[PDB]
């Protein structure tokens, strides 16, 4: 759904507390005012991308604390009140499995923290179990959980009597699949590999920019303050413009690699927001879109940087 808000202070990476370098960087005018605008536009877009997917609800729906769902045993997927963060047993699994440095980089928090993305995913779930699809298209409206399942069944064109004359088994095979998911997430990590991929792209991209402060770029020396310890005014600036050139290219490329990346993350979040809208708030009449069978309903749990879906299928 989103990346970390890595942002670079376009002066400090180029010029480590040096006005000598800053005045030569002013000889390029407004570039840094635009690179700062380019990384800022990514950071702004992460909040929006988190909001579009999770703020897909306009009230905080909640379960009653008594749990009469007809053996549909949601215990591990709703938040647990005893946890510090109000997160679920799936979310206590997920949240394990994925200030300015001398290089002038910075990192910022999301607008909504893990308490809040969890309260949103808790409402997206609680409207689902208390109110069917209807919270996506009007006021809240109570319905019994097995009657949700009845309506769903009739929706995929299996006749609603087929739910009723197997309910106590149906709900068990549903709980059996929930159980297999909790064991699976306890047993594996490569399944989360799509969230691992975004953070690793950003990890090696940061690591690349750091390595480039150690490059000589054809100059006498690769460090600015080491030059200020040894030259003066003309044979110094012939070196400072170079360091500036090589680092300026490092920023151009770094922000190019990130901007085309921020398009991957936006497109991925847009798809995730449509799957809040169409799997979780609804009932998909589209083949293989929500799950790999006929869709019955979908339940979202918060993850680091993203969302996992329990896509539930006949």
């Amino acid at each position: 759904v989103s990346m970390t808000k890595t942002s670079v202070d376009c002066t400090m990476y180029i010029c480590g507390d040096s006005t000598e370098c800053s005045n030569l960087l002013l000889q390029y005018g407004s570039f840094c005012t635009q690179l700062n605008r380019a990384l800022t536009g990514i950071a702004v877009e992460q909040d929006k991308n988190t909001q579009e997917v999770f703020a897909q609800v306009k009230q905080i729906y909640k379960t009653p604390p008594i749990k009469d769902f007809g053996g549909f045993n949601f215990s591990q997927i709703l938040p647990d009140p005893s946890k510090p963060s109000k997160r679920s047993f799936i979310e206590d699994l997920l949240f394990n499995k994925v200030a300015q440095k001398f290089n002038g980089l910075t990192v910022l928090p999301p607008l909504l923290t893990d308490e809040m993305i969890a309260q949103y995913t808790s409402a997206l779930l609680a409207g689902t179990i208390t109110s069917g699809w209807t919270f996506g298209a009007g006021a809240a409206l109570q319905i019994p959980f097995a009657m949700q399942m009845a309506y769903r069944f009739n929706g995929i064109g299996v006749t609603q009597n087929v739910l009723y004359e197997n309910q106590k088994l149906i709900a068990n095979q549903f709980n059996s699949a929930i159980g297999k998911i909790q064991d699976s997430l306890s047993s594996t990590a490569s399944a989360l590999g799509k969230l691992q991929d975004v953070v690793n792209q950003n990890a090696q991209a940061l690591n690349t920019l750091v390595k480039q402060l150690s490059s000589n770029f054809g100059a006498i020396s690769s460090v600015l303050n080491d030059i200020l310890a040894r030259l003066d005014k003309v044979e110094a600036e012939v070196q400072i413009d170079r360091l500036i050139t090589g680092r300026l290219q490092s920023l151009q490329t770094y922000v190019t690699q990130q901007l085309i990346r921020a398009a991957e993350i936006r497109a991925s979040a847009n798809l995730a927001a449509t799957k809040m809208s169409e799997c979780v708030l609804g009932q998909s009449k589209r083949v293989d879109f929500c799950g790999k069978g006929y869709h019955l309903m979908s339940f979202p749990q918060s993850a680091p940087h993203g969302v996992v879906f329990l896509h539930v299928t006949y």
């Binding site: 909640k62 009469d68 809240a140 109570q142």
Partner: protein, 40 residues
């Protein structure tokens, strides 16, 4: 009188629906709504 007050943000007012194994809510009336969506 007005100042830049700061707060931890809110998502909505608490609304548990009063669910149970036999209760339902069916509407008597509806709005024909209109909304605008703008795309570049």
């Amino acid at each position: 009188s007005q100042s830049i007050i700061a707060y931890t943000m809110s998502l909505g007012a608490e609304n548990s629906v009063a669910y149970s194994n036999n209760s339902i809510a069916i509407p008597i009336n509806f709005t024909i709504s209109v909304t605008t969506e703008i795309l570049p």
